[PDB]
Design an enzyme around this catalytic site. Sequence first.
Site, PDB file in Angstrom:
ATOM      1  N   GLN A   1       0.776  -1.079  -0.510  1.00 26.18           N
ATOM      2  CA  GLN A   1       0.038   0.030  -0.079  1.00 26.18           C
ATOM      3  C   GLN A   1       0.789   1.055   0.466  1.00 26.18           C
ATOM      4  OE1 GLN A   1      -1.944   1.030   3.734  1.00 26.18           O
ATOM      5  NE2 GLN A   1      -1.278  -0.630   4.349  1.00 26.18           N
TER       6      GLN A   1
ATOM      7  N   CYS B   1      -5.668   0.694   3.492  1.00 29.94           N
ATOM      8  CA  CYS B   1      -5.141  -0.676   3.559  1.00 29.94           C
ATOM      9  C   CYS B   1      -7.002  -1.478   3.630  1.00 29.94           C
ATOM     10  CB  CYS B   1      -5.421  -0.836   5.826  1.00 29.94           C
ATOM     11  SG  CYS B   1      -6.574  -0.090   6.850  1.00 29.94           S
TER      12      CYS B   1
ATOM     13  N   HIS C   1      -6.609  -1.386  11.246  1.00 29.16           N
ATOM     14  CA  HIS C   1      -6.363  -1.369  10.420  1.00 29.16           C
ATOM     15  C   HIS C   1      -6.648  -3.011   9.047  1.00 29.16           C
ATOM     16  CE1 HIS C   1      -2.533  -2.494   7.329  1.00 29.16           C
ATOM     17  NE2 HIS C   1      -2.887  -3.691   8.109  1.00 29.16           N
TER      18      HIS C   1
ATOM     19  N   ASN D   1      -0.917  -9.343   4.931  1.00 30.38           N
ATOM     20  CA  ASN D   1      -1.017  -7.824   4.814  1.00 30.38           C
ATOM     21  C   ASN D   1      -0.794  -7.352   3.915  1.00 30.38           C
ATOM     22  OD1 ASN D   1      -0.862  -5.883   6.878  1.00 30.38           O
ATOM     23  ND2 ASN D   1       0.770  -5.538   7.594  1.00 30.38           N
TER      24      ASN D   1
HETATM   25  C1  LIG Z   1      -5.540   1.448   7.022  1.00 33.01           C
HETATM   26  C2  LIG Z   1      -4.596   1.129   6.664  1.00 33.01           C
HETATM   27  O1  LIG Z   1      -3.582   2.552   5.828  1.00 33.01           O
HETATM   28  O2  LIG Z   1      -3.216   0.645   7.640  1.00 33.01           O
HETATM   29  C3  LIG Z   1      -6.646   3.205   6.729  1.00 33.01           C
HETATM   30  O3  LIG Z   1      -5.584   4.143   7.451  1.00 33.01           O
HETATM   31  C4  LIG Z   1      -7.718   2.966   7.670  1.00 33.01           C
HETATM   32  O4  LIG Z   1      -9.165   3.006   6.396  1.00 33.01           O
HETATM   33  N1  LIG Z   1      -7.806   3.498   8.868  1.00 33.01           N
HETATM   34  C5  LIG Z   1      -9.138   4.224   9.021  1.00 33.01           C
HETATM   35  C6  LIG Z   1      -9.791   4.501  10.133  1.00 33.01           C
HETATM   36  C7  LIG Z   1     -10.029   5.898   9.514  1.00 33.01           C
HETATM   37  C8  LIG Z   1     -11.028   5.924   9.306  1.00 33.01           C
HETATM   38  C9  LIG Z   1     -12.892   5.240   9.310  1.00 33.01           C
HETATM   39  C10 LIG Z   1     -13.573   4.922   8.215  1.00 33.01           C
HETATM   40  C11 LIG Z   1     -13.648   6.039   7.264  1.00 33.01           C
HETATM   41  C12 LIG Z   1     -12.506   6.725   7.109  1.00 33.01           C
HETATM   42  C13 LIG Z   1     -11.206   6.800   8.190  1.00 33.01           C
HETATM   43  C14 LIG Z   1      -9.879   2.104   9.558  1.00 33.01           C
HETATM   44  O5  LIG Z   1     -10.481   2.110  10.807  1.00 33.01           O
HETATM   45  N2  LIG Z   1      -9.805   1.052   9.294  1.00 33.01           N
HETATM   46  C15 LIG Z   1     -10.550  -0.265   9.490  1.00 33.01           C
HETATM   47  C16 LIG Z   1     -11.596  -0.374   8.440  1.00 33.01           C
HETATM   48  C17 LIG Z   1     -12.492  -1.489   9.588  1.00 33.01           C
HETATM   49  C18 LIG Z   1     -12.565  -0.804  11.067  1.00 33.01           C
HETATM   50  C19 LIG Z   1     -13.399  -1.500   8.248  1.00 33.01           C
END
Ligand SMILES: *[C@@H](C(=O)O)[C@H](O)C(=O)N[C@H](CCc1ccccc1)C(=O)NCCC(C)C
Length: 215
Positions: free
Chosen positions: A19, A25, A162, A182
Amino acid sequence: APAAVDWRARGAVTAVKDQGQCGSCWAFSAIGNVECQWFLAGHPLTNLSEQMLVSCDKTDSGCSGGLMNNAFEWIVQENNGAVYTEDSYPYASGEGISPPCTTSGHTVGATITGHVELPQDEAQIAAWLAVNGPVAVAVDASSWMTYTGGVMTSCVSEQLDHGVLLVGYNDSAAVPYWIIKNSWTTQWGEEGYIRIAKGSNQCLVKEEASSAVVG
Ligand SMILES: *[C@@H](C(=O)O)[C@H](O)C(=O)N[C@H](CCc1ccccc1)C(=O)NCCC(C)C
């Protein structure tokens, strides 16, 4: 089928991706799940595009993050169930920005019709995974920067941050474990993979599990 299932050993999982600097993620988890479900539905294993979601899915937030369940619903509801091949929509968010979405010049590699959210129970998630294949899950990845290999038997489990892909489990090992793909290249963990103890909600692995349905 109970004891141990590893979908990597059944030709169902693609190679580990990267990524980069983008917080994408959610897209890697969602597309990894779709790639495995497409193969298991009787189609050749095809690499599919994370960039399609990062740039085009406006119900998530590109490199700032998103949710696998929103991504699955965007594919069905807004993109006519189409998931493009990775070769026709290559990853372009490595530097941390999402370029504008392009709606043409790509090839459909897979289609899905919906998604299911699995129970927040590890025995129940293993039961589904064993028959139906890899599951998209969310974990607390706080301690994952120190993971050097082996079965992680203790994991900080405070906040989901994540998305990743569950590809198997082994209940006949000394400590039962989960096998997770991952998106931090092959140079991290066990060639891009991590094994965490199964049966104690390690890294909050049971909390947000889902899968696309191709039918
Ligand atoms: C994951 C990564 O690249 O390591 C991302 O930072 C990510 O998607 N983080 C999410 C938190 C921020 C966010 C949540 C919802 C909408 C917009 C931004 C996160 O919690 N990802 C996990 C997704 C699961 C909980 C569905």
